[PDB]
Design a protein around this motif. Structure first.
Motif, PDB file in Angstrom:
ATOM      1  N   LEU A   1       0.739  -1.169   0.000  1.00 45.51           N
ATOM      2  CA  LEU A   1       0.000   0.000   0.000  1.00 45.51           C
ATOM      3  C   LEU A   1       0.851   1.347   0.000  1.00 45.51           C
ATOM      4  CD1 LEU A   1      -3.168   0.937   0.632  1.00 45.51           C
ATOM      5  CD2 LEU A   1      -2.626   0.866   3.002  1.00 45.51           C
ATOM      6  N   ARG A   2       2.211   1.080  -0.100  1.00 46.00           N
ATOM      7  CA  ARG A   2       3.258   2.034  -0.288  1.00 46.00           C
ATOM      8  C   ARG A   2       3.199   2.862  -1.578  1.00 46.00           C
ATOM      9  NH1 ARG A   2       8.070   3.377   2.341  1.00 46.00           N
ATOM     10  NH2 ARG A   2       9.289   4.496   0.728  1.00 46.00           N
ATOM     11  N   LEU A   3       2.827   2.297  -2.703  1.00 44.15           N
ATOM     12  CA  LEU A   3       2.847   3.019  -3.976  1.00 44.15           C
ATOM     13  C   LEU A   3       1.426   3.412  -4.491  1.00 44.15           C
ATOM     14  CD1 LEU A   3       5.236   1.071  -6.505  1.00 44.15           C
ATOM     15  CD2 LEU A   3       5.780   2.419  -4.491  1.00 44.15           C
ATOM     16  N   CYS A   4       0.398   3.475  -3.569  1.00 49.06           N
ATOM     17  CA  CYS A   4      -1.026   3.493  -3.911  1.00 49.06           C
ATOM     18  C   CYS A   4      -1.432   4.967  -3.764  1.00 49.06           C
ATOM     19  CB  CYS A   4      -1.821   2.571  -2.898  1.00 49.06           C
ATOM     20  SG  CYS A   4      -3.617   2.167  -3.183  1.00 49.06           S
ATOM     21  N   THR A   5      -2.553   5.382  -4.265  1.00 46.99           N
ATOM     22  CA  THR A   5      -3.220   6.705  -3.996  1.00 46.99           C
ATOM     23  C   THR A   5      -4.783   6.538  -4.009  1.00 46.99           C
ATOM     24  OG1 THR A   5      -3.093   9.132  -4.201  1.00 46.99           O
ATOM     25  CG2 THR A   5      -3.445   7.835  -6.224  1.00 46.99           C
ATOM     26  N   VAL A   6      -5.487   7.313  -3.134  1.00 48.75           N
ATOM     27  CA  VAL A   6      -6.955   7.307  -2.937  1.00 48.75           C
ATOM     28  C   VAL A   6      -7.553   8.468  -3.727  1.00 48.75           C
ATOM     29  CG1 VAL A   6      -8.884   6.911  -1.395  1.00 48.75           C
ATOM     30  CG2 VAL A   6      -6.567   6.147  -0.794  1.00 48.75           C
ATOM     31  N   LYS A   7      -8.696   8.212  -4.334  1.00 50.08           N
ATOM     32  CA  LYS A   7      -9.404   9.224  -5.108  1.00 50.08           C
ATOM     33  C   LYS A   7     -10.749   9.373  -4.511  1.00 50.08           C
ATOM     34  CE  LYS A   7      -9.288   8.146  -9.946  1.00 50.08           C
ATOM     35  NZ  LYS A   7      -9.145   7.132 -11.052  1.00 50.08           N
TER      36      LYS A   7
ATOM     37  N   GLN B   1     -15.845   9.652   5.315  1.00 44.71           N
ATOM     38  CA  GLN B   1     -14.843  10.601   5.565  1.00 44.71           C
ATOM     39  C   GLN B   1     -13.666   9.953   6.279  1.00 44.71           C
ATOM     40  OE1 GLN B   1     -14.534  12.654   9.128  1.00 44.71           O
ATOM     41  NE2 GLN B   1     -15.121  14.710   8.231  1.00 44.71           N
ATOM     42  N   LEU B   2     -13.987   9.127   7.319  1.00 42.78           N
ATOM     43  CA  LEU B   2     -13.002   8.454   8.107  1.00 42.78           C
ATOM     44  C   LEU B   2     -12.296   7.385   7.352  1.00 42.78           C
ATOM     45  CD1 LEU B   2     -11.845   7.434  10.978  1.00 42.78           C
ATOM     46  CD2 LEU B   2     -14.143   6.683  11.528  1.00 42.78           C
ATOM     47  N   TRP B   3     -13.053   6.524   6.606  1.00 47.88           N
ATOM     48  CA  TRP B   3     -12.472   5.447   5.911  1.00 47.88           C
ATOM     49  C   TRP B   3     -11.445   5.933   4.912  1.00 47.88           C
ATOM     50  CZ3 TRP B   3     -11.342   0.621   5.787  1.00 47.88           C
ATOM     51  CH2 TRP B   3     -11.993  -0.263   6.647  1.00 47.88           C
ATOM     52  N   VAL B   4     -11.799   6.973   4.038  1.00 47.20           N
ATOM     53  CA  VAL B   4     -10.864   7.660   3.129  1.00 47.20           C
ATOM     54  C   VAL B   4      -9.715   8.317   3.945  1.00 47.20           C
ATOM     55  CG1 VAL B   4     -10.650   9.593   1.560  1.00 47.20           C
ATOM     56  CG2 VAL B   4     -12.628   8.128   1.383  1.00 47.20           C
TER      57      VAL B   4
END
Lengths: 368, 362, 368, 362
Positions: A316-322, A353-356
């Motif tokens: 989960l080091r190279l990941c991003t959230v949208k 909100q929390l989960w993100v």
């Protein structure tokens, strides 16, 4: 005298051989056969009592283990933990004593009743055998004494000399029968009295072993009992207190909003579990819910409560959230990586909100 | 397994500590009922085994009784042997009251618990999983909201609200019953054991009072019994010692001799004689004959009516038969009837001939 | 001592119960069974001897009647008539005495050998039964004495007290066996000696009855014998005398002419018999010979020697004889009456002349 | 029937007295032969019956002999019982000589008479009836003469002449034999009877000489026999009287005690012991054990080779076993072999332990 075979056997005609005497020898015998079947019926019943006794204690010994084991399977109470142990050793202690009482029973039946039917009519029946053989001998003795002609004097005198033999030795055989019947009238009463003596003896011995520790048992019966009545009054009160507080929550403070997943062990363990709705990127594709967990910077789901977890993404080091602006459904976010990229949805405004936030936080740990 | 006293905090937030406690209390309830219901069939079986035991004993005590009416009805047999065996039957009936009270005990607690003691736990649990069925469905329902929408959002969300509030009220009822079961499994089983130990113990208390007095009776009688049979051992040997003395010194080879002595109506004599049968061969046979009241009869069985041989003796003559072949014989010849007869000795001939001859003079 | 069961039974080890003693009890018994089969074989043979004895005398008694009856069927001799009667009463007298000897035989076998197998092993086999029962009792007595544990002292003492019972009373049972074997060694020899005594006794008694009249028999044996030797010399001479006279008749005086019928009892009985050839007057007719008889003036013939006679003519008063001049055959005459008239022929010149004379003479009587 | 001594007058004149005497002598000859030949098969049968009797006796005398070799071989049994039975066999053989001589007697007279004693009577009779056959025919022939004829008359008559002369010579031979048969039937039967009576009588004469001496032997022995068995009657009662005295006063309940006493090579002891079997349950069993020449053996049957239990005793140790459960036991442990053993008394333990312990010091 007053004896049962005494009063129906004629001692008085026993040298004298009347039809009365032949009638008494026959009459007295009927009691002898009677007494021998009743002795046998008592031995059969004795093994029946031994058989049922040993099954009643096999059922009893299983029950005492089982009564304890069930209490032992419950939630624990310390006075019971020690009292149940005192009860257990004492309860079993009565069954091994009562099992000894059977073996004792078995023994007395062998010493007494079996010895009695086995030994005790042998010498009388052998005296009966020879007495009736002598009767036989006497009848041919009379037969040979009567059928001689008076002219054959020498031959007749020889035959009468054998009759003096027959008659005498039949009197001799008759006395032995008299002796031996006279022994069994006194003997029958004593032996069976002895048998009954030995029966109530083992009973007295069994209740006394069980009466002897009765004081030790009685202290526990009270101390368990005084404690159980305080426990019940204590449970009444605790459950009163619990019903009223149960009442209170439903009155005015229960809440309708979804409860919040609770993070712990800072951002680098970041322990948080909760369900979401997930969707993959296949051309024909749909939503399902899974139980998610971030543990040790690792985002994982499991198809079931008792299933072992699997990674949403390997690392989960190279990941991003949208945080989607445009999504078919409200409260949806998307999680993008080298492979296994996916779409997620949460149940209400603070869980989204929390989960993100938490998942973006875990990416910072991981990336650190 | 799970922790005790499960309180409302965990219940209403749908925690995994709750989620596993509800998993494990239901599995404890299946083990519990099975073991209670096994303990229930085994306590059933125990009474059946006890009652088979009391009937086995009851039939054995009738077999010791049967000896007693066969025997002589003397004081030690008549009173002691009866007091021993009636105390045996008294003890069977008291023990019957203990199997009646064990049954009561088992029907009170363990039967009730199996039958209707899990029933409100199962009420709360099926209503509670029903709440979560509907909340699972309304979480789905809450999630099917298009992003454009606002009237669907408030409509979906209101359905989620009542589903979540109701799951939480249903949770409070499962929780509270999980505390009730936990104390009920302790107290119903603790009271059961203590009732049983209590009622067993009284039967020995009362028992020993009596049976220790019966031990006293046993040892006192039993002491008279060893000397009594030593007494006997001497007695029947004394008898044997006279008997070898009788056989060696006083034993008689001579025929039993009839006696010619006055009775209710004159001289009586009774005794064995030989006679001839009424078959075609006329074969000789031995019967027991009586002279009484100027009559001669013969006995046909012991304890059965007699048959007349000569109607009257005052009308008889008596033949001393000196030219006959047959030995020790006489003939009695009367008006209606005659009879040849034969005796065992020359003494007995003369004594039976003289008895008829005095009779002919009556 | 020297007895057969004595020297193979161990008195010395009889209270002491060694394997030697158990071996002697077993060893001595084999002779007992032996002796009982030999006693039985003697009873079977005894009835065989009784059966053949009684058939030998049934054959003998038929022979003595039959020897006499054959002599009685002969031509009579007076010395034989009286001697055969003395022989007969004496010969039968030996068979009724020897038949008495069988009945005596039968009796002694019953008094002795049958009494012996019937009575004489009873009290020893009943002592054998109880002795081996006591052995049995001793072995379980030892068994119960050995298997008790040393910690259970009271129980073991009780079991050893019963062993003091078993061992003692087995010594008691062993003595009785010793007594009873010791009686049969002396008894066996005497009884069978007695049996042989009674056998040769009846023989001595039988030869002496038959020896006692031997003098009376011996006088007849001589007087019949002296007479038979004179008879044979007398028969020799009588037959010499008869052979020489037999010789003489054939020498010179026998004659060839027919013998002459001899009239007797004068002309009115006129008894005369002789054959003739007769012929009737039928148209087809022939000759046959018949035996004729004039008796009581009645002329009669008979077809055979043993046939009853029939009249030639009913009455001979009105008849007349014709001495034929003309006849087919020589020596023919004719006899004529009211009915039954007939032709006759005689065998030679003097028989014709006489037959016609006698028949004409009988006509004169009849006519008188 | 006919008259005796038939003389020639009647014969040669063809009388009816002759004619009936010849009728009746032939019928007497058929009766005679049949009765002789019946007397012949019956005298055959008598010897067969006698000989069956002597074999029946001969087998009975072997059955009395069989007792005698079973018994003890004492003087009265050895000599008297043998002299009685050999006299029985001697008498059977003499009686055999009488059945041999009866047979001789019967084969001499009655067999000869049946076989060849009627043969010249039957010769004379068939020749004689042949003479009358021819004379019957020649009387016919004599009668067939025509009255005219004279050469036929003398020719016919000459044939009648020789027929009549020859019938008369044949008549003289029948007559003479009728006298020979008549004396032969008397003398052969009279000599037969007298020979038989004569030979029976000698066997008794000679018999009685001996058997009257044997009567003397019988009465003398038989007299010793009644007192001998009275003697015995006292004897075995004396024995019974000691025995009830032995049982009452001197009878022992104690175990037989082994004895530790010097022999050919040192101390010997022999006696019963219990041991454990070699089966898988190891079950206990009683055998008879001997200590001799520094060895312990056990006997496996009476009168059969022994088996060794310990090879040597000087190499043994002896265990008095105070902590064992088993009662009265010891253990003997030697280099090649060990054996547990168990005895009947505390006396016997100590005595078997001391015997092995002296043995271990040899």
């Amino acid at each position: 005298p007053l004896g049962s075979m005494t009063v129906k056997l004629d001692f008085e005609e026993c040298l004298k051989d009347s039809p009365r005497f032949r009638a008494s020898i026959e009459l007295v015998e009927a009691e002898v056969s009677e007494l021998e079947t009743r002795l046998e019926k008592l031995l059969k019943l004795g093994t029946g009592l031994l058989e049922s006794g040993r099954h009643y204690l096999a059922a009893s010994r299983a029950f005492v283990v089982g009564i304890c084991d069930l209490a032992r399977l419950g939630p624990p109470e310390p006075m019971m933990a020690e009292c149940l142990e005192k009860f257990t050793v004492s309860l079993n202690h009565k069954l091994d004593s009562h099992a000894e009482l059977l073996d004792a029973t078995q023994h007395t039946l062998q010493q007494q009743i079996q010895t009695l039917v086995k030994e005790g009519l042998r010498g009388f029946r052998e005296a009966r055998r020879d007495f009736w053989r002598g009767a036989e001998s006497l009848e041919a003795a009379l037969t040979h004494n009567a059928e001689v002609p008076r002219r054959r004097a020498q031959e007749a005198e020889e035959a009468g000399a054998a009759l003096r033999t027959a008659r005498a030795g039949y009197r001799g055989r008759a006395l032995d029968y008299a002796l031996q019947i006279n022994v069994i009238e006194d003997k029958r009463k004593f032996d069976i009295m002895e048998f009954v003596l030995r029966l109530v003896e083992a009973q007295a011995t069994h209740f006394q072993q069980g009466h002897e520790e009765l004081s030790r048992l009685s202290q526990y019966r009270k101390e368990l009992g005084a404690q159980l009545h305080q426990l019940v009054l204590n449970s009444a009160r605790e459950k009163r207190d619990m019903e009223q507080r149960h009442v209170l929550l439903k009155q005015k403070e229960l809440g309708g909003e979804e409860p919040e997943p609770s993070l712990r062990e800072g951002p680098g363990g970041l322990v948080m579990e909760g369900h979401l709705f997930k969707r993959a990127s296949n051309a024909f594709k749909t939503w399902s819910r899974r139980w998610f967990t971030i543990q040790s910077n690792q985002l994982v789901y499991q198809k079931k409560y008792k299933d072992p977890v699997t990674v949403v993404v390997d690392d989960l080091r190279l990941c991003t959230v949208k945080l989607c602006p445009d999504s078919e459904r409200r409260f949806c976010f998307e999680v993008v990586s080298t492979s296994k990229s996916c779409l997620l949805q949460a149940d209400s405004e603070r869980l989204l909100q929390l989960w993100v936030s938490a998942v973006q936080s875990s990416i910072a740990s991981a990336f650190s």
